Design a binder for this molecule. Structure first.
Ligand SMILES: NC(=O)c1ccc[n+]([C@@H]2O[C@H](COP(=O)([O-])OP(=O)(O)OC[C@H]3O[C@@H](n4cnc5c(N)ncnc54)[C@H](OP(=O)(O)O)[C@@H]3O)[C@@H](O)[C@H]2O)c1
Ligand SMILES: C[C@]12CC[C@H]3[C@@H](CCC4=CC(=O)CC[C@@]43C)[C@@H]1CC[C@@H]2O
Ligand SMILES: [Cl-]
Length: 325
């Protein structure tokens, strides 16, 4: 089934998604200009056909640049590349959804995105600020209306600006909001959430699977562990003894074991690397497979704890992480 040259899996709207892509979030402060563009190019040369991005990562112009260069030289056609962009919290107001997607299209200089997803279920104060809190540091929460925001998303697909629609960081209750929606035109095909062997998302995955929603594993290698936003209490994922042990068995790194685990069970992974060797390393996951014994054993590593808990927002009506799943 899955191979380096062919590893796209079905989405419920008849489209398909490469089961591995390149993540592109990088701390703007300490990232060299051009590093994203260079990485996307290397990834495409390597065999990646899926790139995950977001306007708020401040490098979507580099993503577009890289994709267009590869199309221009004839490495890929547009239809061979799958780009996922994201609608941020400050742009949830229905009237803003389309202009927000149009900005991303203009930044990429592309005609459409393959997947456009609601970044988080929480709405913030609209404005030239990505993360708006007041002087006292109170997160200016805007009133969320997910159904109305989703309707604006649907109109974007109707207009042909995007092939597939999805969400990110949505719990069961939030997905059911959309799924049960009166007059639902386009159901979510994708839910992008933290996922890896310390958090196999067993319940959310079964639930998503019942509705033909595909899970995309963000931070599939356990994040870069930046303390200013990541929960550095847990030990680094790539140090797990089991994962490293299985690595030895297959002559593979802990990262490659981690990625293989998630794809082998139909979860899309979007590991981020701006390093030449590691970009290649992460893609080499089609020449082996894990035994049912091993898959079960890795699953069992499931802590049911999160590296990305977003505690600073736990007091938003739509905070997704309270429910069991
Ligand atoms: N929907 C959301 O809310 C959300 C949230 C977070 C992230 N995301 C998306 O998911 C993507 C990936 O998650 P993530 O960036 O947070 O973290 P990640 O992909 O799990 O891991 C990234 C970190 O691991 C390092 N790394 C990559 N490959 C490695 C390897 N083979 N061995 C050892 N280290 C390796 C990278 O450094 P180097 O670059 O130097 O290799 C980077 O520091 C993000 O870039 C973004 O696209 C989405
Ligand atoms: C946590 C943070 C706001 C949320 C950002 C985070 C960088 C990583 C990140 C990636 C996303 O795609 C969702 C939002 C987040 C989680 C930013 C770093 C500083 C700021 O406080
Ligand atoms: Cl946005």
């Amino acid at each position: 089934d899955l191979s380096a040259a062919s590893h796209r899996i079905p989405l419920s709207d008849g489209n398909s998604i490469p089961i591995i892509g390149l993540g592109t979030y990088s701390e703007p402060k300490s990232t060299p200009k051009g590093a994203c563009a260079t990485s996307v190019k290397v990834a495409i040369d390597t065999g990646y056909r899926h790139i995950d991005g977001a306007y708020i990562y401040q490098n979507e112009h580099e993503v577009g640049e890289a994709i267009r260069e590869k199309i221009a030289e004839g490495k890929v056609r547009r239809e061979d590349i799958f780009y996922c962009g994201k609608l941020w919290a400050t742009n949830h107001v229905p009237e803003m959804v389309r202009p927000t997607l149009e900005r991303t299209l203009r930044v990429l200089q592309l005609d459409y995105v393959d997947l456009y997803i609601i970044h988080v279920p929480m709405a913030f104060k609209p404005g030239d600020e990505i993360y708006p809190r007041d002087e006292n540091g109170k997160w200016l929460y805007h009133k969320s209306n997910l159904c109305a925001t989703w309707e604006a998303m649907e109109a974007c697909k109707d207009a042909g600006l995007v092939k597939s629609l999805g969400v990110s960081n949505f719990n069961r209750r939030q997905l059911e909001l959309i799924l049960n929606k009166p007059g639902l035109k386009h159901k979510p095909v994708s839910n992008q959430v933290e996922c890896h062997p310390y958090f196999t998302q067993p319940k959310l995955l079964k639930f998503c699977q019942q509705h033909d929603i595909v899970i995309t594993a963000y931070s599939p290698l356990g994040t870069s562990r930046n303390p200013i936003w990541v929960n550095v209490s847990s030990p680094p994922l790539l140090k797990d003894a089991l994962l490293n042990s299985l690595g030895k068995r297959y002559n593979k790194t802990a990262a490659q074991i981690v990625l293989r685990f998630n794809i082998q069970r139909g979860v899309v992974v979007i590991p981020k690397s701006f390093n030449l060797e590691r970009i290649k390393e992460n893609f080499q996951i089609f020449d082996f497979s894990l035994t049912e014994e091993e898959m079960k054993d890795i699953e069992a590593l499931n802590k049911n704890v999160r590296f990305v808990e977003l505690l600073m927002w736990r007091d938003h009506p739509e905070y997704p992480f309270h429910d069991e799943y």
